Amino acid sequence: MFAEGRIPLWVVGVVAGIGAIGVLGLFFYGAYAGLGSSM
Amino acid sequence: NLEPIFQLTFLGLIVLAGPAVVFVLAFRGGDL
Amino acid sequence: AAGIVGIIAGLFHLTVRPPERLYKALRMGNIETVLSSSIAAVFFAAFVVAG
Amino acid sequence: MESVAYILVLTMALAVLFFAIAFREPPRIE
Amino acid sequence: MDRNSNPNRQPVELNRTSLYLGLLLVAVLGILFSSYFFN
Amino acid sequence: ASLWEQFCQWVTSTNNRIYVGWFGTLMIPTLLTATTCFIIAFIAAPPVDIDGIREPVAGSLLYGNNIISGAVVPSSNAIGLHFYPIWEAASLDEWLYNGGPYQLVVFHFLIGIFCYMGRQWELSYRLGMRPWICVAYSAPVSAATAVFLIYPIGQGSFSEGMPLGISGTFNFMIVFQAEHNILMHPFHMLGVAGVFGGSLFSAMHGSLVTSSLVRETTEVESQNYGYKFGQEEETYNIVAAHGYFGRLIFQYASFNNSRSLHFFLGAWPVIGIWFTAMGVSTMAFNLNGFNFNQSILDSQGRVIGTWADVLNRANIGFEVMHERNAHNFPLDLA
Amino acid sequence: MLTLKIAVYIVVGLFISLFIFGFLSSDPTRNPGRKDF
Amino acid sequence: LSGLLFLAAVWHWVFWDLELFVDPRTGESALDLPKMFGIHLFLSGLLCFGF
Amino acid sequence: FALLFFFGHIWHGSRTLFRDVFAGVDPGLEEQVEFGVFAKVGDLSTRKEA
Amino acid sequence: VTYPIFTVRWLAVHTLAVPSVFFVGAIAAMQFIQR
Amino acid sequence: GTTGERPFSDIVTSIRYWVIHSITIPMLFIAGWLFVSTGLAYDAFGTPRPDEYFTQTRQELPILQERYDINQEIQEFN
Amino acid sequence: RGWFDVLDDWLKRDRFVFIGWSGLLLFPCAFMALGGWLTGTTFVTSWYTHGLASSYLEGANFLTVAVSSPADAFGHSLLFLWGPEAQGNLTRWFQIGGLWPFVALHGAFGLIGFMLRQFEISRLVGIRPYNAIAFSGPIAVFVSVFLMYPLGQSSWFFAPSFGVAGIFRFILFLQGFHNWTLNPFHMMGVAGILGGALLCAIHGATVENTLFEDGEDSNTFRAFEPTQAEETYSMVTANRFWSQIFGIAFSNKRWLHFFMLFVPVTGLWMSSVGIVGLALNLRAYDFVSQELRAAEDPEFETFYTKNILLNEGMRAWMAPQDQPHENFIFPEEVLPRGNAL
Amino acid sequence: RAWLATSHFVLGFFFLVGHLWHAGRARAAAAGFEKGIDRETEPTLFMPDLD
Amino acid sequence: MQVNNLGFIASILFVLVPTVFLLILFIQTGK
Amino acid sequence: MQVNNLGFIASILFVLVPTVFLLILFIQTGK
Amino acid sequence: GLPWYRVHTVVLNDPGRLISVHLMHTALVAGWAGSMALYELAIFDSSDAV
Amino acid sequence: MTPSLANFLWSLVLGAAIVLIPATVGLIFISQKDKITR
Amino acid sequence: AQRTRLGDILRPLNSEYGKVVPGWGTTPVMGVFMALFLVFLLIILQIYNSSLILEGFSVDWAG
Ligand code: CLA
Ligand code: CLA
Ligand SMILES: CCCCCCCCCCCCCCCC(=O)OC[C@H](CO[C@@H]1O[C@H](CS(=O)(=O)O)[C@@H](O)[C@H](O)[C@H]1O)OC(=O)CCCCCCCCCCCCCCC
Ligand SMILES: CCCCCCCCCCCCCCCC(=O)OC[C@H](COP(=O)(O)OC[C@@H](O)CO)OC(=O)CCCCCCCCCCCCCCC
Ligand SMILES: CCCCCCCCCCCCCCCC(=O)OC[C@H](COP(=O)(O)OC[C@@H](O)CO)OC(=O)CCCCCCCCCCCCCCC
Ligand SMILES: CC1=C(/C=C/C(C)=C/C=C/C(C)=C/C=C/C=C(C)/C=C/C=C(C)/C=C/C2=C(C)CCCC2(C)C)C(C)(C)CCC1
Ligand SMILES: CC1=C(/C=C/C(C)=C/C=C/C(C)=C/C=C/C=C(C)/C=C/C=C(C)/C=C/C2=C(C)CCCC2(C)C)C(C)(C)CCC1
Ligand SMILES: CC1=C(/C=C/C(C)=C\C=C/C(C)=C/C=C/C=C(C)/C=C/C=C(C)\C=C\C2=C(C)CCCC2(C)C)C(C)(C)CCC1
Ligand SMILES: CCCCCCCCCCCCO[C@@H]1O[C@H](CO)[C@@H](O[C@H]2O[C@H](CO)[C@@H](O)[C@H](O)[C@H]2O)[C@H](O)[C@H]1O
Ligand SMILES: CCCCCCCCCCCCO[C@@H]1O[C@H](CO)[C@@H](O[C@H]2O[C@H](CO)[C@@H](O)[C@H](O)[C@H]2O)[C@H](O)[C@H]1O
Ligand SMILES: CCCCCCCCCCCCO[C@@H]1O[C@H](CO)[C@@H](O[C@H]2O[C@H](CO)[C@@H](O)[C@H](O)[C@H]2O)[C@H](O)[C@H]1O
Ligand code: OEX
Ligand SMILES: [Cl-]
Ligand SMILES: [Cl-]
Ligand SMILES: [Fe+2]
DSSP state of L233: B
Residue R62, in any domain of the structure: no
Cα gap L85→L90, rounded to integer Å: 11
* Ligand 12 proximity of F334 Cβ (cutoff 6 Å): yes
Backbone angles phi, psi at P6, to 5 degrees: -115, 5
Cα gap F191→F213, rounded to integer Å: 32
| CA angle at R57 for the pair R55 and R62, rounded to the nearest 5° | 160
For chain C, after which residues does the C atom lie more than 2.5 Å from the next written residue's N, i.e. where is it broken?
A: none
- Which residues constitute the domain of residue L328? 1-341
Which secondary structure element, helix H or strand E, spans residue L162, and what is its range? strand L162-163
Q: Quick one: which of H12, F20, J16, L158 has its CA closest to G30?
A: F20
Cα gap F288→F276, rounded to integer Å: 13
Enumerate residues 6+ apart whose C-beta is below 8 A from N27.
Answer: O24, O27, O28
Find chain F residues with C-beta within 8 A of J35's C-beta: 297-299
Enumerate residues 6+ apart whose C-beta is below 8 A from P6.
Answer: F220
Task: Determine the residue type at L174.
Answer: L
Q: Quick one: which of F74, F271, F92 has its CA closest to F169?
A: F74
Q: Using most ligand atoms within 8 A of CB, pick from F142, F274, F283, F288 the residue to mutate for ligand 2.
A: F274
Q: Quick one: which of F81, F86, F79 has its CA closest to F101?
A: F86
The alpha carbon torsion through H44, H50, I2, I4 (nearest 10 deg) reads -40
Q: Around Cβ F221, how many Cβ atoms within 10 Å? A: 17
* Ligand 12 proximity of F76 Cβ (cutoff 6 Å): no
Find chain P residues with C-beta within 8 A of C32's C-beta: 12
Find chain Q residues with C-beta within 8 A of I37's C-beta: none
Domain positions in chain K = 8-77
Cα gap F92→F71, rounded to integer Å: 19
Q: Around Cβ F187, how many Cβ atoms within 10 Å? A: 21
Facing L47 at nearest CB: one of K3, K48, K71? K48
Tell me whether chains M and D touch (3+ CB pairs under 8 A).
yes
Cα–chain center distance at F149: 12
Q: Around Cβ K57, how many Cβ atoms within 10 Å? A: 8
End-to-end CA distance of chain O: 48
Q: Quick one: which of O6, B8, P10 has its CA closest to N6?
A: O6
Strand partners, M37: L212
| Contact yes or no for L155/L75 (Cβ under 8 A) | yes
Ligand-binding annotation for K16, yes or no, is yes
Ligand 2 atom nearest to F275, measured from its CA: 55
Residues 11-40 of C with CB under 8 A from H: 11-15, 17-18, 28-29, 31, 34
Cα gap R8→H20, rounded to integer Å: 7
Q: Quick one: which of P17, R5, C29, R17 has its CA closest to H26?
A: R17
Nearest chain A CA: its distance from J30 CA (Å) = 8
Nearest chain R CA: its distance from H34 CA (Å) = 9
- Which residues constitute the domain of residue R30? 1-51
Cα gap F227→F332, rounded to integer Å: 59
Q: Does A35 touch chain K (CB under 8 A)?
A: yes
Q: Does C42 touch chain H (CB under 8 A)?
A: no
Q: Does M36 touch chain G (CB under 8 A)?
A: no
Enumerate residues 6+ apart whose C-beta is below 8 A from K69.
Answer: none
Nearest chain D CA: its distance from E35 CA (Å) = 8
Q: Does L290 touch chain D (CB under 8 A)?
A: no
Q: Does I42 touch chain F (CB under 8 A)?
A: no
Q: Quick one: which of L294, L308, E29 has its CA closest to F63?
A: L294
Nearest ligand, CA F191? 4
End-to-end CA distance of chain C: 23
- K54 and F251 within 8 Å at the Cβ level: the answer is no
Task: Determine the residue type at L8.
Answer: D
| CA angle at F291 for the pair F287 and F297, rounded to the nearest 5° | 155
Count: domains in chain L: 1
| CA angle at L287 for the pair L286 and L289, rounded to the nearest 5° | 140
* Ligand 3 proximity of Q20 Cβ (cutoff 6 Å): yes
Residue Q17 C-beta-side C-alpha neighbours within 13 Å: 6
Q: Quick one: which of H12, L48, F74, L180 has its CA closest to K45?
A: L48
Nearest chain K CA: its distance from I3 CA (Å) = 31
| Contact yes or no for F223/L255 (Cβ under 8 A) | no
Strand partners, I25: F214
Ligand 10 atom nearest to L88, measured from its CA: 35
Which secondary structure element, helix H or strand E, spans residue L67, and what is its range? strand L66-67
For chains I and K, CB pairs below 8 A equal 8
Cα gap K46→L45, rounded to integer Å: 8
Strand partners, F48: F57
- E38 and L187 within 8 Å at the Cβ level: the answer is no
Find chain P residues with C-beta within 8 A of C31's C-beta: 12, 18
| Contact yes or no for I29/F240 (Cβ under 8 A) | yes
Q: Does K50 touch chain F (CB under 8 A)?
A: yes
Cα gap L325→L322, rounded to integer Å: 9
Cα gap L206→L211, rounded to integer Å: 9
| Contact yes or no for L136/I12 (Cβ under 8 A) | no
Q: Around Cβ K21, how many Cβ atoms within 10 Å? A: 14
Query: What is the chain L residue with the closest CA to Q38?
Result: L9
Strand partners, L212: M37
* Structure's resolution in angstroms: 2.1
Find chain K residues with C-beta within 8 A of J35's C-beta: 50
| Contact yes or no for D2/F64 (Cβ under 8 A) | no
Which residues have CB under 6 Å of ligand 4?
A: F 132, 135-136, 263, 266-267, 270-271; L 205, 208-209, 218-221; M 25
Which secondary structure element, helix H or strand E, spans residue L87, and what is its range? none
Three-state DSSP class for F187? Answer: helix
Distance P5 CA to ligand 1 centre (A): 7
Backbone angles phi, psi at O13, to 5 degrees: -70, -40
Cα gap P38→P34, rounded to integer Å: 6
Write the CATH number of the domain with boundaries K8-77. 1.20.5.860
Which secondary structure element, helix H or strand E, spans residue E24, and what is its range? helix E16-38
* Ligand 3 proximity of L247 Cβ (cutoff 6 Å): no
Which chains would you list as touching B if contact means 3+ CB atom pairs under 8 Å?
Answer: A
Mutation target vs D (from L234, L237, L243; most D CBs, 10 A cutoff): L243
Ligand-binding annotation for K21, yes or no, is yes
Count: domains in chain R: 1
Which secondary structure element, helix H or strand E, spans residue A5, and what is its range? none
